């Protein structure tokens, strides 16, 4: 069994797991689209009532399972609840991270592609006034890279460069994962995190130096950090805030659990878990929130910045920011640093969502690390073609797996660990070996508050928001739904084979 060599490696690996594209690309959009400061209140509450408690729960379930040679939920859920059904529900712990990896790695490859082009200076050349004359060249740049449709058809035509970069991205992910936990994920985390931090701070510093006739970077911070209690009664903001919390902290993806399964039985998961969660939040609200938003508001003002965030989730990070940078000396290089930052941020997170499948193949099907990594890479690479060529396929996978799936799974793992397994056993398991104890009140939060909070959230969602996404979408969404449902059946079949394999082994022993 592989174990994290050092505590710093563990923290930086777990921090690398959480700190990713969600901090720098997703958070800014979610905040701006929901009133900025009006989004922060529910976000902070969601972090305290959902983020923190679930982080500890996943670290606990992981370490508990790893002690018995299991790093994924199909097996761990069964250990906590001896029921054939626990194995089915556990499949989501392999499905979610696999589906998310299918589109996450692709988006990650974009940042590598852009980074390369911006470094070499193969970027557009804007006409020397007029906002549209500045932004259009960059919009075209993105649209040509990923191949956005021009006609009436929902078909994408990625550039050859984009495709080749995706292959390289997969290769880089494999090169790290194939070396294992300590010599792969950990070695890399110790290099990537410090780099990521320096790049992020440098960018924040450069961004503040932005002052135009429309505003300053300070105006952006005020927008993001000014309370608006008139939206606290809006369910949509709460759904957005909770969704962001889950995504940014890697909760409900089965990633934290798998990583924690490599933590030694005696090791502290309380302080370690809290540190990883805190590092992510700092990287999100302080770093992530201080780059994109302040820069957009500085050049276009609050109103226009918000409109740009509402048009295309990728606008602000792949079109707007590099466009804004292009108007300053060394702006192309600054764009390179922005995309290089995103690449490392994503790379440290993509290896985390691919490890669960790898761990399952090693733990349950007894495959060698080499074979487990290559097969996982093959499944992701192949499946990724659907996201690369079918328009809005990405949007669909992100919803079922990265949005609904994670909240549902988060509630499932809590119920299984804190209700079925036992609230008092769970509590003991979480605190065992801890350098610090979990505050007493959190017992009540985990047992009553968190589950009730997520239960209400899921109910409202399925009533006033999801029916539209089941009756107001293009027919091609069914191609993606069909395929991801097939992935679930495939994983269920593997769980079944793992059962038959273990049974046969128990007879020979
Ligand atoms: C995975 C099973 C079959 C995959 C076939 C992939 C064929 C990719 O084909 C490539 O697509 C690129 C755009 O994405 C084009 O730019 C290339 O010219 C084209 O050769
Ligand atoms: C550097 C790591 C991967 C580099 C892949 C480069 C793929 C280049 O691909 C080429 O790009 C040219 C534009 O630059 C196009 O005009 C060509 O049609 C295209 O085939
Ligand atoms: C993902 C499920 C199916 C993916 C099918 C991808 C088929 C790619 O097909 C290729 O597309 C290229 C343009 O991108 C064309 O230039 C090639 O002639 C065509 O063969
Ligand atoms: C399914 C996910 C992506 C599918 C991309 C399909 C791109 C198809 O492209 C089409 O391929 C046909 C042959 O199959 C050709 O006869 C058409 O002329 C060509 O436009
Ligand atoms: C509305 N569709 C775009 C969905 C994808 N998306 C992702 C997903 C993974 C990593 C980054 C992002 C950045 C853009 C973004 C913003 C808000 C929700 C989802 C997303
Ligand atoms: C899916 C997770 C690994 C995503 C990561 N926590 C991020 O914020 O990008
Ligand atoms: Cl290109
Ligand atoms: Na994050
Ligand atoms: Na990361």
Can you characterise this structure?
It is built from 20 helices and two strands. Helix 1 (7-18) crosses helix 8 (181-208) and helix 6 (131-146) packs across helix 13. The longest helix is centred in the middle third of the chain and has 42 residues, at 270-311. The chain has helices at residues 7-18, 21-33, 37-66, 73-80, 84-120, 131-146, 160-177, 181-208, 217-224, 235-248, 255-260, 270-311, 315-325, 331-363, 369-389, 393-420, 423-431, 441-464, 468-471, 477-507, and strands spanning 211-212, 215-216. It has a two-stranded antiparallel sheet with strand order 1-2. Helices cover 77% and strands 1% of the residues. A hairpin with a 2-residue loop joins strand 1 (211-212) and strand 2 (215-216). The chain has one domain (1-509). It has 509 residues and is mainly alpha-helical. One octyl beta-D-glucopyranoside (BOG) is lined by residues 155, 389-390. One octyl beta-D-glucopyranoside (BOG) binds next to helix 7 and helix 15. This is Na(+):neurotransmitter symporter (Snf family). Phosphocholine 1 binds at residue 84. Phosphocholine 2 binds at residue 84. It comes from Aquifex aeolicus (strain VF5).
Strand percentage: under 5%
> In DSSP terms, counting alpha (H) and pi (I) runs of 4 or more, how many helices?
20
Span between termini:
21 Å
Output the strand order for the largest sheet: 1-2
Q: Which class do the helix and strand fractions yield?
A: mainly alpha
Instruction: Give the total of domains.
Output: 1
Bound molecules: octyl beta-D-glucopyranoside, ligand DSM, leucine, chloride ion, sodium ion
| Oligomer state of the chains in this structure | monomer
* Strand and helix order: HHHHHHHHEEHHHHHHHHHHHH
Q: Nearest-angstrom radius of gyration? A: 22 Å
What overall form do the CA principal axes indicate? globular
How can the largest sheet be summarized? 2 strands, antiparallel
Helix content: over 70%
**Strand tally, please?**
2
Organism: Aquifex aeolicus (strain VF5)
GO cellular component, one term: plasma membrane
Subcellular location: Membrane
Membrane topology: Multi-pass membrane protein
């Amino acid at each position: 069994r592989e174990h994290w060599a050092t505590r710093l490696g563990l923290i930086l690996a777990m921090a690398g797991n959480a700190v990713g594209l969600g901090n720098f690309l997703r958070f800014p959009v979610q905040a701006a689209e929901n009133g900025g400061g009006a989004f922060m209140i529910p976000y902070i509450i969601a972090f305290l009532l959902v983020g923190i408690p679930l982080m500890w729960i996943e670290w606990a379930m992981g370490r508990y399972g790893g002690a018995q040679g299991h790093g994924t939920t199909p097996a761990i859920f069964y250990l906590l609840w001896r029921n054939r059904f626990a194995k089915i529900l556990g499949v989501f712990g392999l499905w979610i991270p696999l589906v998310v990896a299918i589109y996450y790695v692709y988006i990650e490859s974009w940042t590598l592609g852009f980074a390369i082009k911006f470094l070499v200076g193969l970027v557009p050349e804007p006409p020397p006034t007029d906002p549209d004359s500045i932004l259009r060249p960059f919009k075209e740049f993105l649209y040509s890279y990923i191949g956005v449709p021009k006609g009436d058809e929902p078909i994408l035509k990625p550039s050859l460069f984009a495709y080749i970069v995706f292959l390289i991205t997969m290769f880089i992910n494999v090169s790290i994962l194939i070396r294992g936990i300590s010599k792969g994920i950990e070695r890399f985390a110790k290099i990537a995190m410090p780099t990521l931090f320096i790049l992020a701070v440098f960018l924040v510093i450069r961004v503040f130096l932005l002052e135009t006739p429309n505003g300053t970077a300070a105006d952006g911070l005020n927008f993001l950090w000014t309370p608006d209690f008139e939206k606290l009664k809006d369910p949509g903001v709460w759904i957005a805030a909770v969704g962001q919390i889950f995504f940014t902290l890697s909760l409900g993806f089965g990633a934290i659990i798998t990583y924690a399964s490599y933590v030694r039985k005696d090791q502290d998961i309380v302080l370690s878990g809290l540190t990883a969660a805190t590092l992510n939040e700092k990287a999100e609200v302080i770093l992530g929130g201080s780059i994109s938003i302040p820069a957009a508001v500085a050049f276009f003002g609050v109103a226009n910045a918000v409109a740009i965030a509402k048009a295309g989730a990728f606008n602000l990070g792949f079109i707007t920011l590099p466009a804004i940078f292009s108007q300053t000396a060394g702006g192309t290089f600054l764009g390179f640093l922005w995309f290089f930052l995103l690449f490392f941020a994503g790379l440290t997170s993509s290896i985390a969502i691919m490890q669960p499948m790898i761990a399952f193949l090693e733990d349950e099907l007894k495959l060698s690390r080499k074979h487990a990594v290559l097969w996982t890479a093959a499944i992701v690479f192949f499946s990724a073609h659907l996201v690369m060529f079918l328009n809005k396929s990405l949007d669909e996978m992100d919803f079922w797996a990265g949005t609904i799936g994670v909240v549902f799974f988060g509630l499932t793992e809590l119920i299984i660990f804190f209700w079925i397994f036992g609230a008092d056993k769970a509590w003991e398991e979480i605190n065992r070996g801890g350098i610090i104890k979990v505050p007493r009140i959190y017992y009540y939060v985990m047992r009553y508050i968190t589950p009730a909070f997520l239960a209400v959230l899921l109910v409202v969602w399925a009533r006033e928001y999801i029916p539209k996404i089941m009756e107001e979408t293009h027919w091609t969404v069914w191609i993606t739904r069909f395929y991801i449902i097939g992935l679930f059946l495939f994983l269920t079949f593997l769980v079944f084979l793992a059962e038959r394999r273990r049974n046969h082994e128990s007879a020979g022993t």
